[PDB]
């Protein structure tokens, strides 16, 4: 028996099942999606951590996260992401 | 007969002058006016460190001047000495802009 390799396959698989219940996925393109998610996560956490250093903050909070989103992601995509993230934060605020 | 230099001779003289120079070519006051104007577009009542506008000044002028030697490369590659805009959006698009 070998070591578990953590993957993003099942979650994005569920996501594609809401947005396209009909279609399929190729596994290497699925790995492309995993690399995409890991890469943009690495970026966004990068400027988030740097910004937390710049304002001398010990804790990574969602305010600099949305700052980082509109730092990287352009325009209407940024404000859309702001909308869904904001409503999700309110939902988790209401638990 | 009044003195007059031929075309280019002057132009290369200030080419040498502004290459040995390090100093500012734009008047700073319309630059701060323009910066305040365009910053008003994103957010109202903005205040400005003078050094911040200075850093904007060299950053902008360096960006555009780098585009100018790139435009020189484009024009001489097209065997010309006179530039056209198509040089500039060519250089930007190869830069990915």
């Amino acid at each position: 028996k070998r070591s578990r390799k953590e993957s993003y396959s099942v979650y994005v698989y569920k996501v594609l099942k809401q947005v396209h219940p009909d279609t399929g996925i190729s596994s290497k393109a699925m790995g492309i999606m995993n690399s995409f998610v890991n890469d943009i996560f690495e970026r966004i956490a990068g400027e988030a951590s740097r910004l937390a250093h710049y304002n001398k903050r010990s804790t990574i909070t969602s305010r600099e996260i949305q700052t980082a989103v509109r730092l990287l992601l352009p325009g209407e995509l940024a404000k859309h992401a702001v909308s869904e993230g904001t409503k999700a934060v309110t939902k988790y605020t209401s638990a | 007969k009044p003195h007059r230099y031929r075309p280019g001779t002057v132009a290369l003289r200030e080419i040498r002058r502004y290459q040995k120079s390090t100093e500012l070519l734009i008047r700073k006051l319309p630059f701060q006016r323009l910066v305040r104007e365009i910053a008003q577009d994103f957010k109202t009542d903005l205040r400005f460190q003078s050094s911040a506008v200075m850093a904007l000044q060299e950053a902008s002028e360096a960006y555009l001047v780098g585009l100018f030697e790139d435009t020189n490369l484009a024009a001489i590659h097209a065997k010309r000495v006179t530039i056209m805009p198509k040089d500039i959006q060519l250089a930007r698009r190869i830069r990915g802009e």
Partner: protein
């Protein structure tokens, strides 16, 4: 207090001087307008990043070090301003 035509502030011989530091000896009359467009677009990019830093800093006065962050976030690193 309102400003409307400050893109005309980059004067015509100033653009010529900028070309001379770029080493161009001959420039067309059709160059100034798209150079104005390129420089402005670059400026809204950098000031947008800087102001995003600024309301993250929760200030209404922008600082040079935030400008340093805004320029380096696309890799246009400038020295001599607290960086």
């Amino acid at each position: 207090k309102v400003l409307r035509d400050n893109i005309q502030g980059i004067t015509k011989p100033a653009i010529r001087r900028l070309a001379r530091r770029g080493g161009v000896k001959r420039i067309s009359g059709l160059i100034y307008e798209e150079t104005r467009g390129v420089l402005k677009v670059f400026l809204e990019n950098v000031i947008r990043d800087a102001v995003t830093y600024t309301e993250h800093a929760k200030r209404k006065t922008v600082t040079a070090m935030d400008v340093v962050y805004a320029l380096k976030r696309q890799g246009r690193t400038l020295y001599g301003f607290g960086g």
